[PDB]
């Protein structure tokens, strides 16, 4: 039983070239190049899924600080405050109120400032 | 000396960024015969500034 080979093969190469669209020059044209190109894209996105979560928190923190510092408190103390603030728990992401409700924020600083007094 | 990596189909492109021919623009028509003709040149039937020169 001599076996054709080829359709099942063209299936694969196409499967990879398809995942490699928009990649530059041979990255998106030539299987042998295309492959190693997909695999790293894969490895980058497994890394970067983990990364993303770091990136945002640092985005958040940065802007919490801008705001805290604008109401005359450092991020560090502000957090400490919130932490002591009769418990009082509340994502750093969530503290986007920072951008979209400057009055609800100063509220927070006050609550915080207080639990620190 | 020979290349170490194959040049991209793009570099060819860029190298050729200057290969374009230039079209003429600068031809005119003889006041006396039909005859378009390059400026400062004899027209085929043999005219130049009206006045049929070169009898051939």
């Amino acid at each position: 039983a001599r076996v054709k080979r080829g359709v099942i093969a063209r299936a694969r190469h196409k499967k990879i070239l398809k995942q490699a669209k928009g990649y530059y020059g041979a990255r998106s044209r030539v299987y042998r190049v295309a492959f190693q190109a997909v695999i790293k894209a894969g490895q980058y996105a497994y890394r970067d899924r983990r990364q993303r979560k770091r990136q945002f928190r640092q985005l958040w923190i940065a802007r919490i600080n801008a705001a805290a510092r604008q109401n005359g408190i450092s991020y560090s103390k502000f957090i400490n405050g919130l932490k002591k603030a009769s418990v009082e728990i509340d994502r750093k992401i969530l503290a986007d109120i920072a951008v979209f409700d400057k009055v609800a924020f100063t509220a927070l600083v006050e609550k915080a400032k207080a639990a620190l007094a | 000396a020979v290349q170490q990596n194959k040049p991209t189909r793009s570099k060819r492109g860029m190298r050729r960024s200057h290969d374009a021919l230039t079209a003429v623009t600068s031809l005119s028509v003889d006041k006396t015969s039909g005859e378009k003709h390059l400026r400062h040149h004899i027209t085929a039937d043999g005219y130049y500034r009206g006045r049929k020169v070169i009898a051939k």
Binding site: I39, G42, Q43, A45, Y46, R49, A85, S86, V87, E88, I89, D90, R91, I93, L94, D96, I97, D101, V103, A104, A107, L108, K111 | -
Partner: protein
């Protein structure tokens, strides 16, 4: 006029009428969950959980279709070590609409 609440393992700022995607949630497709520990509410003048959770603030929403997110690929590949595996994973989620925000 919004409020905040813990529900994924994550928190969410939310206003009535507004839909949010939460992690999965047994609650059958059409019924009504009631988030009864909101960590803040606000109009023009607002209520922070002096402790966690504002005294009597609750939030109501109706589940509204369950689902599975778009597949994602897990690639592991150790160069020169004759090693690699690829993997597919999806992720259940339930979606709620938000009718509540009972101050």
């Amino acid at each position: 006029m919004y409020a905040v609440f813990q529900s994924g393992g994550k928190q969410h700022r939310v206003s009535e009428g507004q839909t949010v995607r939460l992690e999965k949630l047994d609650i059958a497709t059409g019924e009504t969950v009631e988030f009864a520990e909101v960590l803040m509410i606000a109009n023009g003048e607002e209520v922070k959980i002096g402790v966690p959770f504002v005294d009597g603030g609750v939030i109501k929403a109706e589940v509204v279709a369950h689902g599975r997110g778009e597949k994602v690929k897990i690639v592991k590949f150790r160069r020169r070590k004759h090693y690699r595996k690829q993997q597919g994973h999806r992720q259940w989620f339930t979606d709620v609409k938000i009718t509540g925000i009972s101050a």
